[PDB]
Amino acid sequence: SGMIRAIVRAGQARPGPPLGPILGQRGVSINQFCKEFNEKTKDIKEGIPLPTKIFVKPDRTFEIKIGQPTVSYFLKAAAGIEKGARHTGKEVAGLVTLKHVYEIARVKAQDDAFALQDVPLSSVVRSIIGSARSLGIRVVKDLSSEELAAFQKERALFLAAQREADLAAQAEAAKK
Amino acid sequence: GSKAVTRHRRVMHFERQKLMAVTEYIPPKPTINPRCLPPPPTPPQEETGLVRLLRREIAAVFRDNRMIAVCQHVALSAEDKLLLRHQLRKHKILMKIFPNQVLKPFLEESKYQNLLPLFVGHNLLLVSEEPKVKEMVRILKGIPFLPLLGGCIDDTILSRQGFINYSKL
Amino acid sequence: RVNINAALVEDIINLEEVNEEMKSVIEALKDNFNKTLNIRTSPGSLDKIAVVTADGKLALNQISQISMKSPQLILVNMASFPECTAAAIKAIRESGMNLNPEVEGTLIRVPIPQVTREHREMLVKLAKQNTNKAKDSLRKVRTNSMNKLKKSKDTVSEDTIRLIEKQISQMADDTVAELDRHLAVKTKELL
Amino acid sequence: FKTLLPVPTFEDVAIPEKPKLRFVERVPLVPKVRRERKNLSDIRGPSTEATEFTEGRFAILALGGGYLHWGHFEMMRLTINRSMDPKNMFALWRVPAPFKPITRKGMGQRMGGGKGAIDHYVTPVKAGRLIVEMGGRCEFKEVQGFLDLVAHKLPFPAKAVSRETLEKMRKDQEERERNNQNPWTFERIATANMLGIRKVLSPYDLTHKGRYWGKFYTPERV
Amino acid sequence: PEVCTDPFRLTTHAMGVNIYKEGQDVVLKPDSEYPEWLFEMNVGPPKKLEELDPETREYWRLLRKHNIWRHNRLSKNRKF
Amino acid sequence: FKTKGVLKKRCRDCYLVKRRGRWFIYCKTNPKHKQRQM
Amino acid sequence: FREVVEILDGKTTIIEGRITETPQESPNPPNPTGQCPICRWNLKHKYNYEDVLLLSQFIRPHGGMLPRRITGLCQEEHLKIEECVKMAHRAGLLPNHRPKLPEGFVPKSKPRLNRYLTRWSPRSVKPIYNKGHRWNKVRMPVGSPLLKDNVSYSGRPLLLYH
Amino acid sequence: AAALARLGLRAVKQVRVQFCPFEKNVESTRTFLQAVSSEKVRCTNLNCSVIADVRHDGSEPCVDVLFGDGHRLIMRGAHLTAQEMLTAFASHIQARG
Amino acid sequence: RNRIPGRQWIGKHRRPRPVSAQAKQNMIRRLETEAENQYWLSR
RNA sequence: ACCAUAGUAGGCCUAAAAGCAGCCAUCAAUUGAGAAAGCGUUAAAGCUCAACAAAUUCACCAACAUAAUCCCAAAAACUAAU
Numbered sequence A: 001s002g003m004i005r006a007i008v009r010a011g012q013a014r015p016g017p018p019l020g021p022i023l024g025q026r027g028v029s030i031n032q033f034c035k036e037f038n039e040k041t042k043d044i045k046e047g048i049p050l051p052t053k054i055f056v057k058p059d060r061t062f063e064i065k066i067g068q069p070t071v072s073y074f075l076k077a078a079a080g081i082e083k084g085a086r087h088t089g090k091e092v093a094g095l096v097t098l099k100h101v102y103e104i105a106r107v108k109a110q111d112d113a114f115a116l117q118d119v120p121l122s123s124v125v126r127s128i129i130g131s132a133r134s135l136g137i138r139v140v141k142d143l144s145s146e147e148l149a150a151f152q153k154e155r156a157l158f159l160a161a162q163r164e165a166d167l168a169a170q171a172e173a174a175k176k
Numbered sequence B: 001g002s003k004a005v006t007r008h009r010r011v012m013h014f015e016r017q018k019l020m021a022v023t024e025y026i027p028p029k030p031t032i033n034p035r036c037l038p039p040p041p042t043p044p045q046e047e048t049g050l051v052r053l054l055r056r057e058i059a060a061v062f063r064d065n066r067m068i069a070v071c072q073h074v075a076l077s078a079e080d081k082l083l084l085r086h087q088l089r090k091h092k093i094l095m096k097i098f099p100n101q102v103l104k105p106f107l108e109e110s111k112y113q114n115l116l117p118l119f120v121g122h123n124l125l126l127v128s129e130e131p132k133v134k135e136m137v138r139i140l141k142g143i144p145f146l147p148l149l150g151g152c153i154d155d156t157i158l159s160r161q162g163f164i165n166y167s168k169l
Numbered sequence C: 001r002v003n004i005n006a007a008l009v010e011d012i013i014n015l016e017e018v019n020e021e022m023k024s025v026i027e028a029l030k031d032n033f034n035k036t037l038n039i040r041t042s043p044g045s046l047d048k049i050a051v052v053t054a055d056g057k058l059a060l061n062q063i064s065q066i067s068m069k070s071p072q073l074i075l076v077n078m079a080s081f082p083e084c085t086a087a088a089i090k091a092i093r094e095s096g097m098n099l100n101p102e103v104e105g106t107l108i109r110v111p112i113p114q115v116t117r118e119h120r121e122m123l124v125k126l127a128k129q130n131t132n133k134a135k136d137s138l139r140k141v142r143t144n145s146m147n148k149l150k151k152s153k154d155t156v157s158e159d160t161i162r163l164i165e166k167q168i169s170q171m172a173d174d175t176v177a178e179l180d181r182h183l184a185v186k187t188k189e190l191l
Numbered sequence D: 001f002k003t004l005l006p007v008p009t010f011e012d013v014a015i016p017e018k019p020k021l022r023f024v025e026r027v028p029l030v031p032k033v034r035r036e037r038k039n040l041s042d043i044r045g046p047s048t049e050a051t052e053f054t055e056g057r058f059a060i061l062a063l064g065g066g067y068l069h070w071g072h073f074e075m076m077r078l079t080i081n082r083s084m085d086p087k088n089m090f091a092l093w094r095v096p097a098p099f100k101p102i103t104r105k106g107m108g109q110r111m112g113g114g115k116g117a118i119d120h121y122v123t124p125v126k127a128g129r130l131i132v133e134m135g136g137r138c139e140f141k142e143v144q145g146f147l148d149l150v151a152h153k154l155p156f157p158a159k160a161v162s163r164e165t166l167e168k169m170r171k172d173q174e175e176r177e178r179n180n181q182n183p184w185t186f187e188r189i190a191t192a193n194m195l196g197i198r199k200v201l202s203p204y205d206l207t208h209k210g211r212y213w214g215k216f217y218t219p220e221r222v
Numbered sequence E: 001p002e003v004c005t006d007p008f009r010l011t012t013h014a015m016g017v018n019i020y021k022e023g024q025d026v027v028l029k030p031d032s033e034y035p036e037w038l039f040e041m042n043v044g045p046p047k048k049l050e051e052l053d054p055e056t057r058e059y060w061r062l063l064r065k066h067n068i069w070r071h072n073r074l075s076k077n078r079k080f
Numbered sequence F: 001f002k003t004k005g006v007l008k009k010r011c012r013d014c015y016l017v018k019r020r021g022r023w024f025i026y027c028k029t030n031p032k033h034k035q036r037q038m
Numbered sequence G: 001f002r003e004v005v006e007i008l009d010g011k012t013t014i015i016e017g018r019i020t021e022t023p024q025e026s027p028n029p030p031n032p033t034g035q036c037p038i039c040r041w042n043l044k045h046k047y048n049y050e051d052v053l054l055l056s057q058f059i060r061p062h063g064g065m066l067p068r069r070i071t072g073l074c075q076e077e078h079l080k081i082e083e084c085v086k087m088a089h090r091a092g093l094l095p096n097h098r099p100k101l102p103e104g105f106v107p108k109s110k111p112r113l114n115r116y117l118t119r120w121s122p123r124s125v126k127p128i129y130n131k132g133h134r135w136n137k138v139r140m141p142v143g144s145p146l147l148k149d150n151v152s153y154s155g156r157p158l159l160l161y162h
Numbered sequence H: 001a002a003a004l005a006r007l008g009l010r011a012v013k014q015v016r017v018q019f020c021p022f023e024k025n026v027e028s029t030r031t032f033l034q035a036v037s038s039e040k041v042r043c044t045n046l047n048c049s050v051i052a053d054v055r056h057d058g059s060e061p062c063v064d065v066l067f068g069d070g071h072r073l074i075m076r077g078a079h080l081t082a083q084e085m086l087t088a089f090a091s092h093i094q095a096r097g
Numbered sequence I: 001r002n003r004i005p006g007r008q009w010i011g012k013h014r015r016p017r018p019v020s021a022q023a024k025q026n027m028i029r030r031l032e033t034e035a036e037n038q039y040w041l042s043r
Numbered sequence J: 001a002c003c004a005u006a007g008u009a010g011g012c013c014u015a016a017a018a019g020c021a022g023c024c025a026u027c028a029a030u031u032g033a034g035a036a037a038g039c040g041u042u043a044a045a046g047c048u049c050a051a052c053a054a055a056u057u058c059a060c061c062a063a064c065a066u067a068a069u070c071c072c073a074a075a076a077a078c079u080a081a082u
């Protein structure tokens, strides 16, 4: 029938939206897909969301290919910040080093996307750095000793920014 | 009696119309049309960084590696092309595509001028170091409508039958 | 349409004032006779019921939450402004027809009876009578303007007076045409 | 295979605050109490003011004369604002607000009795004058595309030109005048009073050189 | 549905990349293990057109990207 | 058919042809795009 | 010249291309320095619809035109020769350059009206019922305007509208 | 490729193109081979078998198409244009099929 | 059918009577004669 | 004509914003493809553009109905014309 891209949480498998209508239009039974997803993801319990491709055949049968989880969630977990910056470039969302980028690249090199390509890990590192640039997380070359002080200052800065943003949102809601 | 400026174009006097007609512009007309005339000398083109990089890459390819196979590039699906790329990199032989406009002059200037009829249409250069044609023949046999045109194995220009014989050797 | 500049006189007649009066009369008649006779048993949606709140008039859908319990049962709920429940009940009970609700607390059950009374002909006749009265009022306003012109007919040229009378007659004709169009639209809506 | 060409880059140009065209009043804040004669010389003849670029790179060039009023101003403003990207483009006017009053008779239609009553104001524009000047980090192609509609909707004929386009057309006109083949030209004949042509010509024709007739300007008249 | 970190774990390792069931977080291997291509690459300022060498493929890739941007800007007046 | 003084294509499948001494914008996907130059 | 030959032999279709001998250019052109064929044979501003020997050199056997990328003429001469070929075909010249239709040659129609220097198509021009007055008159176009640059020995300009 | 894809190629069994790439008149033959080996043609029908025979001394490019009407279309294309071969092939297969 | 409003050579809409080659040649000849006259009236 | 794969559903609000109600970044893989220039979905999906590989005629704007008694000299593209 076709192919469907679905980003699903590792520990979450619900027969509802947005997974509901997409499989209902295809006619594939949602319960079987949920059971297969639970069987294939019950070996992982850290709740890292991942994208997957569902190949629905014309006979209403489906196949599942599970790839590596999301780069955005990888960067968020590596930096320690729950949500990314609203205005990228004007504000800093987080701070990581080259070690996290290299580790993410070497653990994502086995995905279905970069498995077919045969470029070295340098290209994957560049892709991760570009994704971090888009997310707003700053990367530094060498600050292993200063990362503690950098973290202790950036946490205060980010909590102050979050408080200011919450105040601005409350003011906008009251004005609207 | 109309005003000095009107909207109906203010049709002029007959003498003024005659004056305009006499004073109408006449473009200069050359005796011989210069379009089909023997053209001016050649304004020679200037080599750019892109063509220089292409020439350097082609020279490096023809210098370093040993197996340089020429195949007819077939318009296949992206997934199949990537799968073929992965299967070829399993044997560590890569593929490249070069434009004919830069490939033909380099080929005719170099010692591989016998490959000119092979590079008329779509082309694909299979580059392999330490050639092993057995795996290449096996992986090409899986696709029926992707024909091996020819190539050179250590400065030995061979056709498809020559490649088959070398693989069997 | 002979229209004067309406600024070259400015003293013996105020065409701007005449137009303002005509437009005010038209608007008042329109609003009143519509909202009075737009009931047609079921006045479009009952969400537009005027309920008193803060010494003002607001629709039921404005100060209420109106849903449809059944196709003939309107379910009102007092959540947005739960302070005029009695006023809302009274307004629903007397809204054009006999729409007696049931005071089930915040919920309000409104059955929809009738829609077979065939009083639309009488409503049309009442609308025609009101339109005739509005025409009479417009004629009175035009006569007052003509009397002002006659009072001014001392030094001002009767040519200018005739031009102003033609302008006023044209405005009156346009206003009565608008009234007739509104009457026709209301008659179509009723029937 | 095709070569790669560099693209223009715009960094020196800075977008000013409020890039959109400002609103223009229908009438001046101080109305003209005294009725003025409708001089047609403000339209007749070539333009001498607002004929060159000041800060923008593109402009709306008028090839003829006419009157612009609040309707035309509003049309131009709305069209440019809705079809212009404020983040990369800015626009400015080159003509003043409508100030010249136009009178209609009104009360009574027979000839005579005095002047009429002021109805609206217009801005006189001569041929060769810029109307709207635009600039920014944008290419002329899109600017010309979305300004051609404004040029067409303007009463007088108009074009969406740039600095390069205006310079090219002026140089083409100069070259045509230079290499015109026939020895007889309107300017020369008018200056020399050949055939007594001054009887049928006009004193302003000595300056117009035959390129201007009333409010109509012919660019190919040399 | 998951939980993030806050203490020295963030600086000492990555605690969100461990994907399987067991909480076996990978440690931060010493700097000597990481090759030079991790450190030689730029991080913050993207390369511009004039910064790159015209005899380099990255310059032509950036020029192609700029050509696509120019074409997209020009084709914003599509009436189709 | 719509008679116009200026003809312009409303989609990429409209083709302009000179027939019977006039110009015609013919479209097959959208029959409403039939334009005839007056 | 290349010819396509189709052979049917027992539900089998054979399509083959056959190359035949073709005439070549004359050895001595008056102006060898000219890039363009007509411009180098000095027939520019000389040919007309009456000159059939030049127009018949490059036209398809069914009366079709020939591509400029193959012919080699300049754009203006290509357009002029296309106009002249159309005029000759409408006038009745090139009798042998029409498709052979054995079925359609039996039902004869009205006799072909003799014409020459025809600009438009005979089936596309509506009669002018008004014809205009002296000052505003709808003149009847005769001949193609592209031929206004031909040499005039008499010196009188060619009347393109009468 | 689009013309062959839109014509419904489900009614073909075998298409083989036998040619010698080292000749001076194989441009049209290779263009035809690439057109008939396009991805759209492949996805139109999977029951067809496409064969590319490469020779060195044959010097006679040709195309043989066997389809289930018991029909064998043989085109000895040595001077024909690739577009002409494509349109003739399409016209024959649509007429008989 | 086609009427000329007003008088033939007075009103706003006049006869569209064009200029002829004979008139052009006559004007050119007169211009040449006057140019020769103004040359002879120079020194 | 010639085809369209990769991080990725780039990050925020919204029931949903997956190139496309909106705001900010606009990186990076394959020689070769814009966090996407037009259609389309509630959200997708899907259909086109430019990018490589195949060639390379030229390719910027310019065309516009009508009245009444009956259309209105007929006609003519080349024998030499300041």
Ligand SMILES: [Mg+2]
Pocket: B001, B002, B003
């Ligand atoms: Mg006068």
Ligand SMILES: [Mg+2]
Pocket: D151, D152, D153, D154, D155, D156, D157
């Ligand atoms: Mg206009």
Ligand SMILES: [Mg+2]
Pocket: I004, I005, I006, I007
């Ligand atoms: Mg008369």
Ligand SMILES: [Mg+2]
Pocket: I004, I005, I006, I007, I008, I009, I010, I011, I012, I013, I014
């Ligand atoms: Mg007149």
Ligand SMILES: [Mg+2]
Pocket: E061, J030
């Ligand atoms: Mg790339």
Ligand SMILES: [Mg+2]
Pocket: J050
């Ligand atoms: Mg494309």
Ligand SMILES: [Mg+2]
Pocket: J065
């Ligand atoms: Mg009509």
Ligand SMILES: [Zn+2]
Pocket: F010, F011, F012, F013, F014, F026, F027, F028, F029, F030, F033
């Ligand atoms: Zn269309």
Ligand SMILES: [Zn+2]
Pocket: B036, G036, G037, G039, G073, G074, G075, G077
């Ligand atoms: Zn030529």
